[PDB]
Design a protein around this nucleic acid. Structure first.
Ligand SMILES: [Mg+2]
Ligand SMILES: [Mg+2]
Ligand SMILES: [Mg+2]
Ligand SMILES: [Mg+2]
Ligand SMILES: [Mg+2]
Ligand SMILES: [Mg+2]
Ligand SMILES: [Mg+2]
Ligand SMILES: [Mg+2]
Ligand SMILES: [Mg+2]
Ligand SMILES: [Mg+2]
Ligand SMILES: [Mg+2]
Ligand SMILES: [Mg+2]
Ligand SMILES: [Mg+2]
Ligand SMILES: [Mg+2]
Ligand SMILES: [Mg+2]
Ligand SMILES: [Mg+2]
Ligand SMILES: [Mg+2]
Ligand SMILES: [Mg+2]
Ligand SMILES: [Mg+2]
Ligand SMILES: [Mg+2]
Ligand SMILES: [Mg+2]
Ligand SMILES: [Mg+2]
Ligand SMILES: [Mg+2]
Ligand SMILES: [Mg+2]
Ligand SMILES: [Mg+2]
Ligand SMILES: [Mg+2]
Ligand SMILES: [Mg+2]
Ligand SMILES: [Mg+2]
Ligand SMILES: [Mg+2]
Ligand SMILES: [Mg+2]
Ligand SMILES: [Mg+2]
Ligand SMILES: [Mg+2]
Ligand SMILES: [Mg+2]
Ligand SMILES: [Mg+2]
Ligand SMILES: [Mg+2]
Ligand SMILES: [Mg+2]
Ligand SMILES: [Mg+2]
Ligand SMILES: [Mg+2]
Ligand SMILES: [Mg+2]
Ligand SMILES: [Mg+2]
Ligand SMILES: [Mg+2]
Ligand SMILES: [Mg+2]
Ligand SMILES: [Mg+2]
Ligand SMILES: [Mg+2]
Ligand SMILES: [Mg+2]
Ligand SMILES: [Mg+2]
Ligand SMILES: [Mg+2]
Ligand SMILES: [Mg+2]
Ligand SMILES: [Mg+2]
Ligand SMILES: [Mg+2]
Ligand SMILES: [Zn+2]
Lengths: 77, 252, 91, 135, 112
RNA sequence: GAUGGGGAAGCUCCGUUUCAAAGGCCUGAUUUUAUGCAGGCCACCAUCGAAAGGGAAUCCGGUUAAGAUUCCGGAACCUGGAUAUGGAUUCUUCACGGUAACGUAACUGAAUGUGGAGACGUCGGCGCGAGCCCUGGGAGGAGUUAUCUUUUCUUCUUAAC
RNA sequence: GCUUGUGACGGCCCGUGAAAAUCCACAGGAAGGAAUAGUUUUCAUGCCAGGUCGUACUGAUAACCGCAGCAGGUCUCCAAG
RNA sequence: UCUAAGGGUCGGGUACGAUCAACUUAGAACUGGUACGGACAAGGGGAAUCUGACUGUCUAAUUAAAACAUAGCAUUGCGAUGGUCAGAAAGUGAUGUUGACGCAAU
């Protein structure tokens, strides 16, 4: 139900006790008017809400993805 | 022979009153200490239409002398009493429109409404849109006051009996021709099942003392005795005279 | 463009009911629908709201009064008499 | 007089502090560059001393008599000028223009006026000024 | 073209059976029932819909923080501010005139 | 339509808050112990009566030979109950800010009182929303092509929350 | 444009067009509550639970009522060029 | 097949320009076996007499009328310890959440 943007505030969620699952979705999308790029949504399934963090930047993405809790059960795509 | 129409009304079935929409029964305050030793103030918090009544009602609220809270009475609004106006009720109350005083405390010629027959009966006389009673005089020893009702009837009552100064609003409602069946219809739709009326003369003999005949006609005198019996009384009951009232009326 | 010789508002009723009945009604309708002067705030913004109930556009005061007019002649002469009589009992 | 001067009591008549009583301590009778209106800087009483009685003893008395003050810049068209009047010398300095702007300044200010108002309540000076206006 | 059906059993157009059409991610029209509208709470004093106060159906007010049910000042969620201004003034003046009628008739009792 | 009642030979009739000693809650008092009494209220006095009136809260996709707002999947929400962690608040104890209308993530509140909502006709034009209808471009699939038509048809959707 | 929803208005009345459960708010301030550490679940997040009965289909020139698979009767929503 | 009239949006120191999008109406030519609201859709009119004013009502299943009702007009009863009406009775009931600008009865 909820969307998120503070990339630290998100990081805190990913370790918020009741969070067993997560999912990473990748989408082709366009930019301004010309070229395309690679959108990527970070979805933490809370017990009461499903949080999703859009990272527009492909670079920010990759480095974020590694930081994902090494105990967290993430579904890729 | 069938039971005739006026008899059927007594058993109250389709004939009862159409009561759902009505604001409440209108009554003066209960006759407590304050109202018969001093006065007590209220405020008309709203004047408002009562369904099937022709005069507006006035919701007027007071304090409970005995408990912390408001108690709201329902009054019949006299003419020219207005929202937010202060309302005074009591023996020792003042003589303006809207207030309510024992008839003992008002000079002759006072004009008052919703007047009690007995004290603390919370209003009985002159309540219909327009009417009032007039004080024609008092008699201090064995205390009474005499009034002339809307009927014209003189009648004397206890001077402790309360009245409210003024006449009742909505005067002249009966001046405007109803004009079409519908208005009468909607009129009674909020009173009772009294309309429209079949003439007994249009019915059969089972139906009425006026029923039958090969031409429509009453057949015998239609002045019926006081001592007549149920199912007999149709027409001009107890009538002591009859016909076009030639001449001025007005109680001598 | 004067619209009718004489029936005024009574036009709705067309030819029905008969002149006299309509005359009488026109009188009292013209009374009730009319807009009146407010005794309290001074603006003429009192229109009627059901038989007997006269209330004010702005300032929202409601005065009980005549069935189709704000002040009925009867109540008027009462007002004066209550004046008169009250006079006596303070002086 | 130009009756909105140094020590007038007045009742705030809008916004939170509505119905509460104040003292004028400084009057900007004409404008600010901001505050484009005649306006007073007042110290008022936000949470009055509750009543106290013989039944009240020792500490409960100490408790009942605590006062929550307040200070405010306010348009003249929000005070009822009152016939009453109380002295404002203890906190002339305390309630400044410069006292508003930057919160900590306002907090220390109220601290004084809190101690200022409570001294004044014991030995019932201005007794009226210490009783909620009811409405 | 595409038509639609009620979703509850009640077939009739009563206030509590308002409908509203809607396109789904299936790409088809379907009814959806629409609860009767909130009405704004009213200043129980002058009567106006009173400002600053969110507007729900009554039970739904228990599902909302108090800052949706008041404005700050005294008689907050209750009366219309301008209404309170009146309250304040009238109270003050009357309480004062109270005193003026005291010492005036207090003078009389001694001057007669 | 039961009840204290009143009629009636009786089946029963009347009455519904009415000539009635009509009841139950908040917690304190217990640290013999579970719940006696201590306050203080509240005198509202059965109940039945709406599958169209009032009314806490759910949606979209998928699935069956026959069920689906009920299963599956996903995402919500309400009510009762428990409860801790974070935040807020406090040395000026019970939030600040804004002249003000008012703001907010919070920001103690018993009895008692009061206010709102629930909650309300009908017709008329005006204004706006939604869905439908009409239509340009492009991206597809279809039909007609002796002849003519950058064509004719169709797909291009987005729930509650 | 069509249908529906809604708003600010206006016309009408001797017609002025339910009730109750229920939810909230306010006035009140009984009480209770901190500096060696208090108060706070109307902010957020977190934990458990939600019973009973109905849910098929017809709703009509054949599933209902008219002796019947009767040209009759029988409340309603959606509505293309 | 032509013509004229009726609109929207922008920038102008403190007269005009630019484009976008609507069927309404009136006029003018041409044109045909004089037809053209081409199907569908869709009032006969007039002069009087009788009778009920009107809209409304009824004999389901032989009478829809001039019959009933109606507004309007007039008469009667009644101030509650009451009028009129209900019940076998009654600490019973309708009008009555009522009060003569009312209720009841012709
Ligand atoms: Mg009744
Ligand atoms: Mg009838
Ligand atoms: Mg008759
Ligand atoms: Mg008749
Ligand atoms: Mg006959
Ligand atoms: Mg006879
Ligand atoms: Mg006979
Ligand atoms: Mg006969
Ligand atoms: Mg005859
Ligand atoms: Mg407070
Ligand atoms: Mg299509
Ligand atoms: Mg269904
Ligand atoms: Mg409707
Ligand atoms: Mg808000
Ligand atoms: Mg608010
Ligand atoms: Mg019984
Ligand atoms: Mg029930
Ligand atoms: Mg129901
Ligand atoms: Mg229902
Ligand atoms: Mg489905
Ligand atoms: Mg199955
Ligand atoms: Mg099915
Ligand atoms: Mg599921
Ligand atoms: Mg789930
Ligand atoms: Mg909960
Ligand atoms: Mg804060
Ligand atoms: Mg209430
Ligand atoms: Mg209400
Ligand atoms: Mg309703
Ligand atoms: Mg929903
Ligand atoms: Mg329709
Ligand atoms: Mg209205
Ligand atoms: Mg509310
Ligand atoms: Mg105590
Ligand atoms: Mg919560
Ligand atoms: Mg249970
Ligand atoms: Mg089904
Ligand atoms: Mg079938
Ligand atoms: Mg058949
Ligand atoms: Mg043009
Ligand atoms: Mg010409
Ligand atoms: Mg006829
Ligand atoms: Mg006819
Ligand atoms: Mg027949
Ligand atoms: Mg027969
Ligand atoms: Mg006919
Ligand atoms: Mg026939
Ligand atoms: Mg006739
Ligand atoms: Mg005649
Ligand atoms: Mg008896
Ligand atoms: Zn006025």
């Amino acid at each position: 139900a909820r969307e998120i943007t503070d990339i630290k505030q998100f990081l805190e969620l990913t370790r918020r006790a009741d969070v067993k699952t997560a999912t990473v979705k990748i989408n082709k999308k366009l930019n301004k008017a010309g070229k395309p790029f690679r959108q990527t949504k970070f979805k933490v399934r809370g017990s009461s809400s499903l949080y999703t963090l859009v990272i527009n930047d492909a670079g920010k993405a990759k480095k974020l993805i590694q930081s994902l809790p090494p105990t967290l059960k993430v579904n890729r795509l | 022979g069938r039971v005739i129409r006026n008899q059927r009304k007594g058993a109250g079935s389709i004939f009862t009153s159409h009561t759902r929409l009505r604001q409440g029964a209108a009554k003066l305050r209960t006759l407590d200490y304050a109202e018969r030793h001093g006065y007590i103030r209220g405020i008309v918090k709203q004047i408002v239409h009562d369904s099937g009544r022709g005069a507006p009602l006035a919701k007027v609220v007071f304090r409970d002398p005995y408990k912390y809270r408001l108690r709201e009475e329902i009054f019949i609004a006299n003419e020219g009493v207005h929202t937010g106006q202060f309302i005074y009720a009591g023996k020792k109350a003042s003589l303006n429109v809207g207030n309510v005083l024992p008839l003992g405390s008002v000079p002759e010629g006072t004009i008052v409404s919703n007047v009690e027959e007995k004290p603390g009966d919370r209003g009985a006389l002159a309540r219909a849109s327009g009417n009032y009673v007039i004080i024609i005089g008092h008699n201090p020893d064995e205390n009474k006051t005499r009034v002339r009702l809307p009927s014209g009837a003189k009648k004397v009552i206890s001077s402790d009996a309360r009245g409210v100064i003024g006449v009742i609003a909505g005067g002249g409602r009966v001046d405007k021709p109803l004009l079409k069946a519908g208005r009468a219809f909607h009129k009674y739709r909020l009173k009772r099942n009294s309309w429209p009326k079949t003439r007994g003369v249009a019915m059969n003999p089972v139906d009425h003392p006026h029923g039958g005949g090969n031409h429509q006609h009453i057949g015998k005198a239609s002045t019926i005795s006081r001592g007549a019996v149920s199912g007999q009384k149709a027409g001009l009951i107890a009538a002591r005279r009859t016909g076009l009232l030639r001449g001025s009326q007005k109680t001598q | 463009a004067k619209r009718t010789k004489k029936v005024g508002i009574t036009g709705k009723y067309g030819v029905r009911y008969g002149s006299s009945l309509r005359r009488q009604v026109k009188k009292l309708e013209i009374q009730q629908h009319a807009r009146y002067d407010c005794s309290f705030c001074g603006k003429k913004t009192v229109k009627r709201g059901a038989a007997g109930i006269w209330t004010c556009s702005c300032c929202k005061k409601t005065v009980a009064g005549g069935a189709y007019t704000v002040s009925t002649a009867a109540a008027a002469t009462v007002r004066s008499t209550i004046r008169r009589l009250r006079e006596m009992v303070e002086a | 007089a130009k009756f909105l001067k140094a020590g007038k009591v007045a009742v705030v008549v809008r916004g939170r502090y509505a119905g509460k009583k104040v003292v004028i301590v400084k009057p900007h009778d004409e404008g600010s560059k901001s505050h484009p209106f005649g306006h007073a800087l007042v110290a008022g009483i936000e949470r009055y001393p509750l009543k106290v009685t013989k039944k009240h003893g020792a500490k409960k008395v100490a408790k009942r008599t605590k006062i929550k003050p307040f200070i405010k810049v306010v348009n003249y068209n929000h005070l009822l000028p009152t016939r009453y009047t109380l002295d404002v010398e203890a906190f002339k300095s305390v309630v400044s223009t410069e006292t508003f702007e930057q919160p900590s300044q306002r907090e220390e200010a109220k601290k004084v006026v809190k101690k200022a108002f409570e001294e004044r309540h014991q030995a019932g000076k201005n007794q009226w000024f210490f009783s909620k206006l009811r409405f | 073209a595409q038509r639609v059906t009620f979703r509850r059993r009640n077939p009739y157009n009563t206030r509590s059976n308002k409908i509203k059409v809607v396109k789904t991610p299936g790409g088809i029209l379907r009814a959806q029932h629409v609860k009767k509208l909130a009405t704004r709470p009213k200043c129980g004093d002058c009567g106006s819909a009173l400002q600053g106060i969110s507007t729900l159906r009554p039970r739904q007010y228990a599902t909302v923080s108090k800052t949706h049910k008041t404005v700050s000042r005294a008689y907050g969620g209750s009366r219309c501010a301008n209404c309170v201004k009146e309250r304040i003034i009238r109270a003050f003046l009357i309480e004062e005139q109270k005193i003026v009628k005291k010492v005036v008739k207090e003078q009389t009792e001694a001057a007669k």
